[PDB]
A paper describes a structure:
Despite extensive trials, only MtMce4A39–140 crystallized readily in several conditions in space group P65. Although Matthews coefficient calculations suggest the presence of 6–8 molecules in the asymmetric unit, assuming a solvent content of about 50%, the solved structure showed that only four molecules are present in the asymmetric unit, corresponding to a solvent content of about 71%. The structure was refined at 2.9 Å resolution. The domain-swapped dimer is formed by the extension of residues 107–141 from one molecule into the other molecule. The swapped region contains two β-strands and an extended loop [Fig. 3(a)]. The residues from 107 to 141 are exchanged between the two monomers to complete the signature MCE fold. In comparison to the homologs from E. coli (EcMlaD, EcPqiB and EcLetB) and A. baumannii MlaD (AbMlaD), the overall MCE fold with a seven-stranded β-barrel is conserved in the domain-swapped dimer of MtMce4A39–140. The dimer appears to be selectively crystallized, for example favored by better crystal contacts, compared with the monomer.
Numbering used by the authors:
A (entry chain B): 32 to 144
B (entry chain A): 39 to 145
Amino acid sequence: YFQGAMASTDTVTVSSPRAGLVMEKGAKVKYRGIQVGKVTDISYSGNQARLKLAIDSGEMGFIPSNATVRIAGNTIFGAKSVEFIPPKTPSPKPLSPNAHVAASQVQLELEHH
Amino acid sequence: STDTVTVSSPRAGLVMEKGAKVKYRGIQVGKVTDISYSGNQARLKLAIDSGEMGFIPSNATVRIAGNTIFGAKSVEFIPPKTPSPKPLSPNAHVAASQVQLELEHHH
């Protein structure tokens, strides 16, 4: 390898115990209250998700090699598709070019496996 | 050319693969382009073909199939029982067994 210009960071990977995890935009990495990096990439392969972190070079000298990872978050609805359903009594006027579908007209269903 | 249709979500915690397909009676009519989260409400921004909205009635409902997944927000390294003197090595990998998924509190 060759020495970088400045602001060098080291990459570290994290395996997700639950597949299908998603990461929020601009997620940070902390250690004892201090931000030490950020989450750059996230790849799905089969039934496992891996996270790629970017910790500062100087900050990784303080994290023990036997430390654990704690990921906070909430359960959300991960949707894959959107489908319009023909109503029981359809309207003559088609969908207008600038239409809005109210939330009461939306049906959230769980997929089958 | 495409036209934009917006859709409100019954759940604020809704994510979607970018460029997910929008279908009507088996055939694809467009794709979702963006999701706006103003406040605690989610609004989908669809983009469907111009010649496809003539077949979709104005009073058509929307079905969205998906799964309940974990929406991570932050990653934190936790000091162990007894920290080892050797620091984290570059390109190290922490296995899924050493990962703890916790739900955050809400007031």
